[PDB]
Design a protein around this ligand. Structure first.
Ligand SMILES: [K+]
Ligand SMILES: [Mg+2]
Ligand SMILES: [Mg+2]
Ligand SMILES: [Mg+2]
Ligand SMILES: [Mg+2]
Ligand SMILES: [Mg+2]
Ligand SMILES: [Mg+2]
Ligand SMILES: [Mg+2]
Ligand SMILES: [Mg+2]
Ligand SMILES: [Mg+2]
Ligand SMILES: [Mg+2]
Ligand SMILES: [Mg+2]
Ligand SMILES: [Mg+2]
Ligand SMILES: [Mg+2]
Ligand SMILES: [Mg+2]
Ligand SMILES: [Mg+2]
Ligand SMILES: [Mg+2]
Ligand SMILES: [Mg+2]
Ligand SMILES: [Mg+2]
Ligand SMILES: [Mg+2]
Ligand SMILES: [Mg+2]
Ligand SMILES: [Mg+2]
Ligand SMILES: [Mg+2]
Ligand SMILES: [Mg+2]
Ligand SMILES: [Mg+2]
Ligand SMILES: [Mg+2]
Ligand SMILES: [Mg+2]
Ligand SMILES: [Mg+2]
Ligand SMILES: [Mg+2]
Ligand SMILES: [Mg+2]
Ligand SMILES: [Mg+2]
Ligand SMILES: [Mg+2]
Ligand SMILES: [Mg+2]
Ligand SMILES: [Mg+2]
Ligand SMILES: [Mg+2]
Ligand SMILES: [Mg+2]
Ligand SMILES: [Mg+2]
Ligand SMILES: [Mg+2]
Ligand SMILES: [Mg+2]
Ligand SMILES: [Mg+2]
Ligand SMILES: [Mg+2]
Ligand SMILES: [Mg+2]
Ligand SMILES: [Mg+2]
Ligand SMILES: [Mg+2]
Ligand SMILES: [Mg+2]
Ligand SMILES: [Mg+2]
Ligand SMILES: [Mg+2]
Ligand SMILES: [Mg+2]
Ligand SMILES: [Mg+2]
Ligand SMILES: [Mg+2]
Ligand SMILES: [Mg+2]
Ligand SMILES: [Mg+2]
Ligand SMILES: [Mg+2]
Ligand SMILES: [Mg+2]
Ligand SMILES: [Mg+2]
Ligand SMILES: [Mg+2]
Ligand SMILES: [Mg+2]
Ligand SMILES: [Mg+2]
Ligand SMILES: [Mg+2]
Ligand SMILES: [Mg+2]
Ligand SMILES: [Mg+2]
Ligand SMILES: [Mg+2]
Ligand SMILES: [Mg+2]
Ligand SMILES: [Mg+2]
Ligand SMILES: [Mg+2]
Ligand SMILES: [Mg+2]
Ligand SMILES: [Mg+2]
Ligand SMILES: [Mg+2]
Ligand SMILES: [Mg+2]
Ligand SMILES: [Mg+2]
Ligand SMILES: [Mg+2]
Ligand SMILES: [Mg+2]
Ligand SMILES: [Mg+2]
Ligand SMILES: [Mg+2]
Ligand SMILES: [Mg+2]
Ligand SMILES: [Mg+2]
Ligand SMILES: [Mg+2]
Ligand SMILES: [Mg+2]
Ligand SMILES: [Mg+2]
Ligand SMILES: [Mg+2]
Ligand SMILES: [Mg+2]
Ligand SMILES: [Mg+2]
Ligand SMILES: [Mg+2]
Ligand SMILES: [Mg+2]
Ligand SMILES: [Mg+2]
Ligand SMILES: [Mg+2]
Ligand SMILES: [Mg+2]
Ligand SMILES: [Mg+2]
Ligand SMILES: [Mg+2]
Ligand SMILES: [Mg+2]
Ligand SMILES: [Mg+2]
Ligand SMILES: [Mg+2]
Ligand SMILES: [Mg+2]
Ligand SMILES: [Mg+2]
Ligand SMILES: [Mg+2]
Ligand SMILES: [Mg+2]
Ligand SMILES: [Mg+2]
Ligand SMILES: [Mg+2]
Ligand SMILES: [Mg+2]
Ligand SMILES: [Mg+2]
Ligand SMILES: [Mg+2]
Ligand SMILES: [Mg+2]
Ligand SMILES: [Mg+2]
Ligand SMILES: [Mg+2]
Ligand SMILES: [Mg+2]
Ligand SMILES: [Mg+2]
Ligand SMILES: [Mg+2]
Ligand SMILES: [Mg+2]
Ligand SMILES: [Mg+2]
Ligand SMILES: [Mg+2]
Ligand SMILES: [Mg+2]
Ligand SMILES: [Mg+2]
Ligand SMILES: [Mg+2]
Ligand SMILES: [Mg+2]
Ligand SMILES: [Mg+2]
Ligand SMILES: [Mg+2]
Ligand SMILES: [Mg+2]
Ligand SMILES: [Mg+2]
Ligand SMILES: [Mg+2]
Ligand SMILES: [Mg+2]
Ligand SMILES: [Mg+2]
Ligand SMILES: [Mg+2]
Ligand SMILES: [Mg+2]
Ligand SMILES: [Mg+2]
Ligand SMILES: [Mg+2]
Ligand SMILES: [Mg+2]
Ligand SMILES: [Mg+2]
Ligand SMILES: [Mg+2]
Ligand SMILES: [Mg+2]
Ligand SMILES: [Mg+2]
Ligand SMILES: [Mg+2]
Ligand SMILES: [Mg+2]
Ligand SMILES: [Mg+2]
Ligand SMILES: [Mg+2]
Ligand SMILES: [Mg+2]
Ligand SMILES: [Mg+2]
Ligand SMILES: [Mg+2]
Ligand SMILES: [Mg+2]
Ligand SMILES: [Mg+2]
Ligand SMILES: [Mg+2]
Ligand SMILES: [Mg+2]
Ligand SMILES: [Mg+2]
Ligand SMILES: [Mg+2]
Ligand SMILES: [Mg+2]
Ligand SMILES: [Mg+2]
Ligand SMILES: [Mg+2]
Ligand SMILES: [Mg+2]
Ligand SMILES: [Mg+2]
Ligand SMILES: [Mg+2]
Ligand SMILES: [Mg+2]
Ligand SMILES: [Mg+2]
Ligand SMILES: [Mg+2]
Ligand SMILES: [Mg+2]
Ligand SMILES: [Mg+2]
Ligand SMILES: [Mg+2]
Ligand SMILES: [Mg+2]
Ligand SMILES: [Mg+2]
Ligand SMILES: [Mg+2]
Ligand SMILES: [Mg+2]
Ligand SMILES: [Mg+2]
Ligand SMILES: [Mg+2]
Ligand SMILES: [Mg+2]
Ligand SMILES: [Mg+2]
Ligand SMILES: [Mg+2]
Ligand SMILES: [Mg+2]
Ligand SMILES: [Mg+2]
Ligand SMILES: [Mg+2]
Ligand SMILES: [Mg+2]
Ligand SMILES: [Mg+2]
Ligand SMILES: [Mg+2]
Ligand SMILES: [Mg+2]
Ligand SMILES: [Mg+2]
Ligand SMILES: [Mg+2]
Ligand SMILES: [Mg+2]
Ligand SMILES: [Mg+2]
Ligand SMILES: [Mg+2]
Ligand SMILES: [Mg+2]
Lengths: 249, 122
RNA sequence: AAGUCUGGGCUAAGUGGUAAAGGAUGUGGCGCCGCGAAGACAGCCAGGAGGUGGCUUAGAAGCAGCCAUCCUUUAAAGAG
RNA sequence: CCUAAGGUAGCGAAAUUCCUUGUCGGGUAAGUUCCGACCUGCACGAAAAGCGUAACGACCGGAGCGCUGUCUCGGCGAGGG
RNA sequence: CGAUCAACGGAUAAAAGUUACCCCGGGGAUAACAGGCUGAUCUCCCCCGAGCGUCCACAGCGGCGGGGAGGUUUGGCACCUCGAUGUCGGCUCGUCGCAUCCUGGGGCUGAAGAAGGUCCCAAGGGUUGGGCUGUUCGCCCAUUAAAGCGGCACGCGAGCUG
RNA sequence: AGCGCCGGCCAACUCCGUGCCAGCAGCCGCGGUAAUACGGAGGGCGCGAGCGUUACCCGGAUUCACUGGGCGUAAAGGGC
RNA sequence: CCGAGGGUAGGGCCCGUGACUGGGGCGAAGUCGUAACAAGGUAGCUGUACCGGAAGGUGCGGCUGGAU
RNA sequence: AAUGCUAAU
RNA sequence: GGCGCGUUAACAAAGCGGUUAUGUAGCGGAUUGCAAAUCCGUCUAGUCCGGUUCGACUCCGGAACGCGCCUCCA
């Protein structure tokens, strides 16, 4: 929801070291823009380039209403300029990718023993008169999923029931942590895509001091101000077409 | 007298050659199937490009048995093999032709289309 | 083996003759205030209304959730 | 950081894998076994040899065909008791 | 004066393992099976009524806590049995309990009908065949009115299997 | 009266919009804010009850060479 | 007797398909190095052999399509 | 001795 | 569960009852067309709780966490 704290992932796209340099240009843009909006920023993952850029930078935006504003910057951002890494004064079209995500909880995972069945039974293998007559072997079933764990590592039904429940949780936890990864992944590829020059959401053309946002048909010429944080123009212009979009029917 | 494991020839053109009985669909625990009784079977042998294929779990009605069938007029009939026509859940045949004779019992048990398509009814 | 012994009382569950939180117009007995022929309690005969909803709601308008629950014909009628 | 040096080729859920009936594929109507793969090998590994190998085996697995009183499910008959 | 004779009343100046190749003398003075006592564990049933259930605590549910029953499991204890109480599973043969899987009879339903849910009465009878595994248990296939859970030395080896 | 075409091959050019987007394409290549190469327009070229596209055959291909090719280093002398 | 064809059993060739596996082509950006083209900074290339994350390195012989 | 330099006439 | 070991900064990893560990990173500077390599400088610490002591990262006890080994005759 638009009121949650958000997490911005800026990755470097097509363009090599200049892509990483432009990635840093996006990075300082959002940090400064955030500070002007009140939101706190903390970096979590940075991968700098010795030329000053970032292969990838992940930072959170801590403030009431971060996903409301920053959500509009998810996509491929196109730069066109004469790179500092170019020697023959050429204009290279490079790109960066920015992913914006709602900050996840953590949500402690616990077994609901009412959807868990525990079977006890005689074990297998050695043990003489003991193994013959002892219900030391444990099964544990997560009844909704059906996934089970068995254990007869010890001679104690209690130590075995404990080791089996512990494993059932650890396994269920991984299944839960993995369906989320799929969600976190399909969602990123809905924003970043391949990172190509096309799929662009907004071009920053330095030779013509222009910044165009191709979704709404908006362009300004305050490029120095855009790349410094004064993004509030384009956001409002985006919000407008979004409200004009919500017109039924 | 057909039971689980019993192999039956297939007297239709579904492409099935041999079905192996796996259930007598007669109440809770019928031991044997005779003429007119539906069984469940898996298709053990078939021919290429037919409707049914090796491995399907189909239904079928027994049409010919090697154990003689007895009759109220004191006679009895005996066939050289165990045969079945593969059917659908509404008890209708799934092929379009029935090969060989069939027991007249099938008439009195609702299998007219099978009795119709059969070349001889004994 | 020795009382179908005497006198007073309780129990109706064969309780006696196997159990707990807890539930109960079981039964008996003590209390303590309360209301009554300023006609009580029960039943029955009515009045049981009106401005009509107040935030919320397309109706929620006496009869979802929130706000406090104003007053008159009065013998009393609650915005219930 | 440590060690005397940090498992090479080959092989691997194995006569070795605890979690385990791992996972995927095959076979079956259905396969904790089996076969083929994968490799986070609890706890393979190179003459206490490693990986293969035609032939051989009253060795030990898995499957099909044939055929059966093993079985559904028992019946009768013979002789010695 | 010389003792971590520290196993500290200190066996020698001087001493570690292993036995499924094992042995004898003993013990139910003491473990593993079963029984017994107990009932933490296990199974079942209640009390309370926060909250859910559009509305509505109680159709179906029941936070935090509370009280019990049973004697299938895992334990505690070490009381008969160590001059022997044969131990898993299967097979065979049953019999009992009822906290009932089906079938019979009911009340409530968030029960239109059909089909369910839930609880009450009820133990007469019934409660299938297969794949995997030594398995019990469990999964799966195909059915079924249903494919019940327990006790009987985890029933039953002077009945069989192994 | 329509259809194809107007960067070069190849006959036929200008204005607007677009801005490596949308698109063009047989090859070489066009398009990233002054595009005869995209789209439309005016004009032009070619054919005309037809004009284009696709598939295939032969040609261009002396690029399987009989006509009519090659093998030191371009593909190509067999290790002897 | 022959005989369409049906059945049985064992071979041959071909096509599709298969967990997994092997490399190959491709890519306006990634990671590690820098083997080759200058004597490419150890002349290169070569057949083979052994070894190595990788390009490669080294041994033996060969070639000049090698510099000064 | 001494490594590297992406991508738009 | 028993027994043993540990917990230090960005990471890895040491000594120590009072006190610049160290390596590599990171930061400032140089060199370089630029990046590295290189050179000159530089810097961030001891898991919680309770003890002992003048003073505890250091010693004693407990907790959490991680590692190692054992869990056998039935
Ligand atoms: K032993
Ligand atoms: Mg990264
Ligand atoms: Mg350059
Ligand atoms: Mg339970
Ligand atoms: Mg056991
Ligand atoms: Mg076993
Ligand atoms: Mg043993
Ligand atoms: Mg026991
Ligand atoms: Mg047939
Ligand atoms: Mg077929
Ligand atoms: Mg088959
Ligand atoms: Mg098949
Ligand atoms: Mg048919
Ligand atoms: Mg036939
Ligand atoms: Mg009397
Ligand atoms: Mg008297
Ligand atoms: Mg009573
Ligand atoms: Mg009594
Ligand atoms: Mg009583
Ligand atoms: Mg009571
Ligand atoms: Mg009382
Ligand atoms: Mg090893
Ligand atoms: Mg080595
Ligand atoms: Mg080697
Ligand atoms: Mg290896
Ligand atoms: Mg393996
Ligand atoms: Mg396996
Ligand atoms: Mg192996
Ligand atoms: Mg092993
Ligand atoms: Mg295993
Ligand atoms: Mg195992
Ligand atoms: Mg399985
Ligand atoms: Mg399969
Ligand atoms: Mg087959
Ligand atoms: Mg499988
Ligand atoms: Mg088997
Ligand atoms: Mg295998
Ligand atoms: Mg694995
Ligand atoms: Mg070995
Ligand atoms: Mg050795
Ligand atoms: Mg060995
Ligand atoms: Mg050796
Ligand atoms: Mg050997
Ligand atoms: Mg081998
Ligand atoms: Mg060989
Ligand atoms: Mg061999
Ligand atoms: Mg062999
Ligand atoms: Mg042999
Ligand atoms: Mg042998
Ligand atoms: Mg021999
Ligand atoms: Mg067979
Ligand atoms: Mg066989
Ligand atoms: Mg067979
Ligand atoms: Mg017999
Ligand atoms: Mg006999
Ligand atoms: Mg006799
Ligand atoms: Mg000592
Ligand atoms: Mg002593
Ligand atoms: Mg001593
Ligand atoms: Mg003393
Ligand atoms: Mg002495
Ligand atoms: Mg001495
Ligand atoms: Mg001694
Ligand atoms: Mg000894
Ligand atoms: Mg011994
Ligand atoms: Mg031994
Ligand atoms: Mg031995
Ligand atoms: Mg011996
Ligand atoms: Mg002996
Ligand atoms: Mg002896
Ligand atoms: Mg002995
Ligand atoms: Mg003895
Ligand atoms: Mg003795
Ligand atoms: Mg004694
Ligand atoms: Mg005793
Ligand atoms: Mg003693
Ligand atoms: Mg004992
Ligand atoms: Mg015991
Ligand atoms: Mg004992
Ligand atoms: Mg015990
Ligand atoms: Mg016993
Ligand atoms: Mg005992
Ligand atoms: Mg006893
Ligand atoms: Mg109890
Ligand atoms: Mg008790
Ligand atoms: Mg309890
Ligand atoms: Mg109760
Ligand atoms: Mg209640
Ligand atoms: Mg509610
Ligand atoms: Mg209600
Ligand atoms: Mg509860
Ligand atoms: Mg209690
Ligand atoms: Mg109790
Ligand atoms: Mg209790
Ligand atoms: Mg309890
Ligand atoms: Mg008991
Ligand atoms: Mg008992
Ligand atoms: Mg014990
Ligand atoms: Mg016990
Ligand atoms: Mg005692
Ligand atoms: Mg004994
Ligand atoms: Mg005796
Ligand atoms: Mg005796
Ligand atoms: Mg004896
Ligand atoms: Mg005896
Ligand atoms: Mg009852
Ligand atoms: Mg009933
Ligand atoms: Mg009923
Ligand atoms: Mg009912
Ligand atoms: Mg009904
Ligand atoms: Mg009820
Ligand atoms: Mg009954
Ligand atoms: Mg079986
Ligand atoms: Mg089988
Ligand atoms: Mg089983
Ligand atoms: Mg099992
Ligand atoms: Mg029913
Ligand atoms: Mg059912
Ligand atoms: Mg069954
Ligand atoms: Mg029983
Ligand atoms: Mg027993
Ligand atoms: Mg039993
Ligand atoms: Mg027994
Ligand atoms: Mg007995
Ligand atoms: Mg025996
Ligand atoms: Mg037995
Ligand atoms: Mg006996
Ligand atoms: Mg006996
Ligand atoms: Mg006996
Ligand atoms: Mg044995
Ligand atoms: Mg044996
Ligand atoms: Mg044209
Ligand atoms: Mg032309
Ligand atoms: Mg021209
Ligand atoms: Mg065109
Ligand atoms: Mg542009
Ligand atoms: Mg323009
Ligand atoms: Mg231009
Ligand atoms: Mg233009
Ligand atoms: Mg053109
Ligand atoms: Mg044009
Ligand atoms: Mg041609
Ligand atoms: Mg030609
Ligand atoms: Mg050619
Ligand atoms: Mg010629
Ligand atoms: Mg030529
Ligand atoms: Mg030559
Ligand atoms: Mg012939
Ligand atoms: Mg023929
Ligand atoms: Mg024929
Ligand atoms: Mg093939
Ligand atoms: Mg090089
Ligand atoms: Mg070289
Ligand atoms: Mg160089
Ligand atoms: Mg070099
Ligand atoms: Mg070189
Ligand atoms: Mg030199
Ligand atoms: Mg060489
Ligand atoms: Mg070397
Ligand atoms: Mg170097
Ligand atoms: Mg590099
Ligand atoms: Mg490179
Ligand atoms: Mg370049
Ligand atoms: Mg330390
Ligand atoms: Mg550390
Ligand atoms: Mg050190
Ligand atoms: Mg030290
Ligand atoms: Mg200090
Ligand atoms: Mg310093
Ligand atoms: Mg330092
Ligand atoms: Mg520096
Ligand atoms: Mg520099
Ligand atoms: Mg302290
Ligand atoms: Mg202190
Ligand atoms: Mg500390
Ligand atoms: Mg401590
Ligand atoms: Mg031992």
């Amino acid at each position: 929801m638009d009121e949650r704290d958000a997490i911005v992932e800026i990755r470097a796209g097509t363009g090599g070291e200049e892509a990483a340099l432009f990635a840093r240009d996006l990075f300082n843009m959002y940090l400064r823009f955030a500070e002007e909006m009140g939101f706190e920023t903390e970096v979590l993952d940075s991968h700098p380039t010795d030329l000053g850029g970032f292969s990838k930078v992940v930072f959170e935006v801590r403030g009431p209403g971060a996903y409301g504003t920053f959500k509009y910057e998810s996509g491929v951002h196109r730069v066109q300029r004469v790179p500092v890494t170019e020697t023959q004064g050429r204009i290279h079209t490079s790109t960066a990718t920015v992913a914006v995500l709602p900050k996840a909880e953590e949500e402690d995972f616990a077994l609901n023993m009412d959807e868990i069945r525990i079977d006890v039974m005689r074990a297998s293998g050695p043990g003489g008169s003991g193994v013959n007559t002892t219900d030391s072997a444990v099964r544990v079933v997560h009844l909704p999923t059906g996934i089970m764990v068995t254990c007869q590592d010890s001679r104690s039904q209690i130590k075995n029931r404990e080791k089996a429940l512990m494993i059932l949780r650890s396994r269920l936890l991984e299944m839960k942590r993995a369906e989320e990864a799929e969600r976190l992944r399909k969602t990123r590829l809905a924003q970043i895509g391949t990172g190509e020059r096309s799929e662009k959401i907004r071009t920053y053309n330095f030779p013509q001091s222009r910044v165009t946002d191709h979704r709404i048909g908006f362009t300004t010429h305050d490029l120095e101000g855009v790349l410094s944080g004064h993004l509030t123009p384009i956001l409002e212009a985006l919000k407008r077409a979004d409200q004009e979009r919500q017109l039924a029917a | 007298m057909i039971q689980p494991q019993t192999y039956l020839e297939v007297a239709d053109n579904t492409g099935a050659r041999k079905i192996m009985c796996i259930r007598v669909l007669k109440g809770s625990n019928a031991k044997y199937a005779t003429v007119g009784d539906v069984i469940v079977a898996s298709v053990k042998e078939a021919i290429p490009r037919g409707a049914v294929k090796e491995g399907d779990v189909v239904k079928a009605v027994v049409v010919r048995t090697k154990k003689e069938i007895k009759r109220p007029d004191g006679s009895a009939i005996r066939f050289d093999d165990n045969a079945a026509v593969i059917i659908n859940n509404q008890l209708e045949p799934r092929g379009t032709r029935v090969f060989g004779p069939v027991a007249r019992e099938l008439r009195e048990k609702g299998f007219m289309k099978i009795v119709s398509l059969a070349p001889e009814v004994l």
